[PDB]
């Protein structure tokens, strides 16, 4: 903490020909570690960072596949196949952090002008709080499922081949709850629309009031449709019950 929460905000300034070579991705890392004083550990040494996308951002993709590297006699239980899936869900969490970053930016740009308020002020901010809550419960859903309920496994399951199988099972559930499998594809389809809508909402700062209202109506249509879709995949996911509860109280 205050490593990732400082890395992401400084990275989204870049995503343009920047973050290409490993001299500019390595220097934001030094800013991220000093902001927490929990890095500069021997665990923090020997890491590998890669890219798979160049910023042209609009597009909703994000680069920086981070990996944790381990040496050769322990590279039989922590393998070279798990780190690809760990980086795949790490990039997804970075994409997830992008929405709350953009809505925090629009919120804070609204804070400094609170001259005097008006009606355009309030009709602008209620869209922002709508999307702010949506990113907070999909973030808390990630915080509850991937970080907490299956991480209770592989800690009392610790009892030679069984260690590999338990690690693979924990990884398989980590990619299962991370919306990268095919059982969670209709949930994954709406998230691209949410990404594009909140980045367009960052871009709209007022240029046209009706444009932001149209973006609000499309966002509400996609969330209302997602409310019906996630119920169908519990009839099919005990983990998705956490999100289906977080989004529906006053939502129809």
């Amino acid at each position: 903490g205050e490593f990732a929460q400082s890395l992401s905000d400084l990275l989204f300034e870049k995503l343009p020909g920047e973050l290409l070579n490993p001299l500019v991705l390595n220097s934001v890392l030094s800013k991220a570690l000093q902001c927490s004083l929990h890095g500069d550990t021997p665990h923090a040494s020997n890491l590998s960072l890669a890219l798979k996308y160049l910023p042209e951002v609009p597009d909703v993709l994000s680069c920086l596949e981070l990996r944790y590297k381990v040496d050769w006699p322990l590279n039989i239980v922590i393998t070279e196949g798990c780190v690809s899936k760990y980086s795949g869900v790490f990039s997804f969490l970075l994409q997830l952090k992008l929405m709350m970053w953009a809505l925090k930016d629009v919120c804070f740009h609204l804070k400094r002008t609170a001259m005097a308020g008006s009606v355009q002020f309030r009709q602008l901010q209620l869209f922002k709080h709508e999307m702010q809550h949506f990113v907070k419960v999909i973030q808390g859903y990630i915080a509850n499922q991937i970080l907490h309920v299956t991480w209770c496994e592989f800690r009392a399951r610790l009892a030679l081949e069984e260690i590999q199988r338990a690690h693979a099972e924990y990884l398989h559930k980590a990619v299962f709850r991370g919306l990268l499998t095919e059982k969670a594809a209709p949930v994954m389809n709406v998230i691209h629309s949410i990404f594009s809508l909140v980045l367009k909402f960052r871009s709209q700062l007022h240029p046209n009031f009706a444009l932001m209202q149209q973006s609000y109506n499309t966002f509400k249509y996609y969330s209302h449709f997602l409310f019906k879709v996630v119920t169908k995949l519990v009839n099919r996911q005990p983990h998705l019950e956490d999100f289906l509860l977080r989004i529906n109280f006053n939502n129809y």
């Binding site: 903490g1 004083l37 709350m100 901010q125 419960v137 509850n144």
Partner: protein, 420 residues
């Protein structure tokens, strides 16, 4: 990120000194600042990494006609801090007029402490409304922070004067300072004299020394709210991202603050959440419902119980909210501090926006109006006359808090395209 405590008011300076001795007991530090042999974790949120691993607390002491600095001087907490940060009335208007003439050097003190820190993100205030010296000077300091720093945060941990109708000048001062807190502060954590005093009479057997135990309660509340910032978790450890989820309604930024141990001298998270949503465990005083709820649980916690607790809490309809969006109850986890001298390390906190506080605000909206009609309790002080000749600033504060009441009642509705 890093925040600097600006203590003002008599009870504000009391909770500031209590907060620093609480953090001295909490962290593995000496009363000089030197690192101990039982203390890596972060100690950079309130402490500068000074000379010999001296974790010197960054603080601003402001008052008028000094009283508590003598108790600071004959203590080992004049050897923990004060390399030069200590600066030396009874009404809002007298405090406003006194802060007007010495605004330059107190702004120089704010600039000096901002240059002292390494990452300025917000100015946290440990303040007491109608504490004596705090009234007026605190509101003028809020105006100075709003004018000079629109890009940084203003956090106010404050108690508000309620005696259940004692002092006849405090409703004017509290309503004016409340209008200044709406327009010139970014987030307010509200506390009350009757709520803390009633819970103190419940959990203990006191009634007269309310101040010394209110210091302990507010220090524990402030340490619990900054536990995830001081000790590293990995959720929203900057102040901006933490308060970003906490405020659902951009004018309604007054947050409920509960605490599941009233006295800290087993339990599941379901039971303390059922406890924590009850207003009897909250130290804050028709259709009332929340807008968004968040709670932070720190202790010997099993995370799958945080799952099942969140499931049962939202489904059994004890999270009561009718919003104009999807805004909901939120779970959050924290790591309990290593080397607390306190036992029973399971503790819970809630930070939620509730419309019921509007009713308490309505009492103040009654009181000033009542004391405007009797006209023997505005007292006709001359500093109030030179503050404003028409006395329409109090009517402006009443208008602002009336808009606040209508915004609470509109946030109860599923529409916020119309407030009154």
């Amino acid at each position: 990120r890093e925040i600097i405590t600006l203590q003002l008011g008599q009870c504000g300076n009391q909770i500031g000194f209590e907060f620093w001795k609480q953090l001295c007991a909490e962290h593995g530090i000496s009363p000089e600042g030197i690192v101990e042999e039982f203390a890596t974790d972060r100690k950079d949120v309130f402490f500068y990494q000074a000379d010999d691993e001296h974790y010197i607390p960054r603080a601003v002491l402001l008052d008028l006609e000094p009283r508590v600095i003598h108790s600071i001087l004959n203590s080992p907490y004049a050897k923990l801090y004060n390399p030069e940060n200590i600066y030396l009335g009874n009404n809002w208007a007298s405090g406003f007029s006194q802060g007007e003439k010495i605004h330059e050097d107190i702004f120089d003190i704010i600039d000096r402490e901002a240059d002292g820190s390494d990452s300025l993100e917000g100015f946290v205030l440990c303040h007491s409304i109608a504490g004596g010296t705090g009234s007026g000077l605190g509101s003028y300091l809020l105006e100075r922070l709003n004018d000079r720093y629109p890009k940084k945060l203003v956090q106010t941990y404050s108690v508000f004067p309620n005696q259940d109708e004692d002092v006849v000048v405090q409703p004017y001062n509290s309503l004016l300072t409340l209008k200044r807190l709406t327009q010139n502060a970014d987030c307010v954590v509200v506390l009350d004299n009757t709520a803390l005093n009633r819970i103190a009479t419940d959990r203990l057997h006191i009634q007269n020394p309310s101040f010394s135990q209110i210091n302990q309660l507010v220090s524990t509340i402030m340490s619990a709210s900054t536990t995830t910032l001081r000790y590293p978790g990995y959720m929203n450890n900057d102040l901006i991202g933490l308060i970003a989820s906490l405020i659902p309604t951009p004018r309604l930024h007054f947050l409920m603050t509960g605490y599941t141990p009233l006295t800290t001298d087993k339990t599941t998270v379901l039971d303390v959440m059922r406890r924590l949503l009850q207003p009897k465990n909250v130290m804050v005083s028709t259709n009332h419902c929340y807008i968004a709820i968040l709670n932070i649980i720190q202790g010997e916690v099993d995370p799958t119980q945080v799952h099942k607790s969140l499931q049962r809490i939202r489904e059994r309809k004890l999270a009561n909210f009718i919003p104009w969006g999807p805004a909901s109850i939120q779970v959050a986890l924290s790591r309990k501090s290593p080397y607390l001298p306190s036992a029973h390390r399971v503790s819970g906190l809630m930070m939620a926006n509730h419309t019921s506080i509007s009713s308490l605000f309505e009492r103040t909206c009654r009181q000033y109006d009542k004391l405007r009609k009797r006209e023997a309790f505005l007292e006709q002080f001359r500093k109030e006359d030179m503050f404003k000749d028409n006395f329409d600033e109090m009517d402006t504060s009443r208008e602002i808090v009336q808009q606040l009441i209508d915004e609470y009642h509109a946030a109860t509705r599923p529409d916020y395209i119309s407030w009154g």
